[PDB]
């Protein structure tokens, strides 16, 4: 059918997610790229200080974080495509807040992860959980299935 419009947004704490992102808009003509971004504070340059501030927002003790990102109008869409890294088996936080903030939208959801290879299974069915409501197409590692998501 026609081609989907198609719009990229990403959380990148090292940045690996960000170059995954820029690669994948290089590929899917016409995609639209956007960065979201959390304050100084919320998490930490150190990475395990990170990963707990993270585990106690998926254990209910402290809030999900507050993000920025440009005024979108999600349904100016057809596909969404999602990057985040894995972290313990989740999507990082500022994806929970992201999904949310998409409950309105009518089209068609993926997930691209970057990870040094391990708890992807558990990735898949979290992000699916938070992203409860909206069409969730797949959810893959790096621009695997980028193809099989632009038919
Ligand atoms: C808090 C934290 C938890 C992580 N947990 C996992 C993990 O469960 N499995 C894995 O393969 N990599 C894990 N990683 C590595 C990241 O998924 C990987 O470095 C990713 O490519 C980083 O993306 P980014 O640079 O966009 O933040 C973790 C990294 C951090 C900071």
Same mark, same amino acid.
């Given at each position: &059918?026609?081609?989907?419009?198609?719009? %990229?947004?990403?959380? /990148?704490?090292? &940045?690996?997610?960000?170059?995954?992102? !820029?690669? %994948?808009?290089?590929?899917?003509?016409?995609?639209?790229?956007?960065?979201?971004?959390?304050?100084?504070? $919320?998490?930490?340059?150190?990475?395990?200080? $990170?990963?707990?501030?993270?585990?106690?927002?998926?254990?209910?003790?402290?809030?999900?974080? !507050?993000?920025?990102?440009?005024?979108?109008?999600?349904?100016?869409?057809?596909?969404?495509? %999602? &990057?985040?890294?894995?972290? /313990?088996?989740?999507?990082?936080?500022?994806?929970?807040?992201?999904?949310?903030?998409?409950?309105?939208?009518?089209? !068609?959801?993926?997930?691209?992860? $970057?990870?040094? &290879?391990?708890?992807?299974?558990?990735?898949?069915?979290?992000?699916?959980?938070?992203?409860?409501?909206?069409?969730? %197409?797949?959810?893959?590692?790096?621009? /695997?299935?980028?193809?099989?998501?632009?038919?």
């Amino acid at each position: &059918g026609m081609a989907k419009k198609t719009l %990229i947004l990403y959380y /990148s704490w090292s &940045g690996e997610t960000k170059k995954m992102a !820029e690669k %994948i808009n290089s590929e899917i003509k016409d995609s639209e790229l956007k960065e979201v971004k959390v304050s100084e504070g $919320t998490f930490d340059a150190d990475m395990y200080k $990170t990963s707990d501030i993270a585990l106690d927002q998926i254990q209910g003790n402290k809030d999900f974080p !507050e993000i920025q990102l440009d005024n979108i109008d999600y349904n100016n869409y057809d596909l969404i495509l %999602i &990057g985040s890294p894995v972290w /313990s088996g989740y999507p990082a936080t500022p994806i929970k807040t992201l999904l949310d903030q998409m409950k309105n939208y009518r089209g !068609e959801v993926a997930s691209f992860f $970057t990870s040094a &290879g391990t708890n992807h299974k558990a990735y898949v069915s979290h992000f699916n959980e938070w992203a409860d409501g909206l069409n969730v %197409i797949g959810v893959a590692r790096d621009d /695997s299935e980028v193809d099989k998501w632009s038919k």
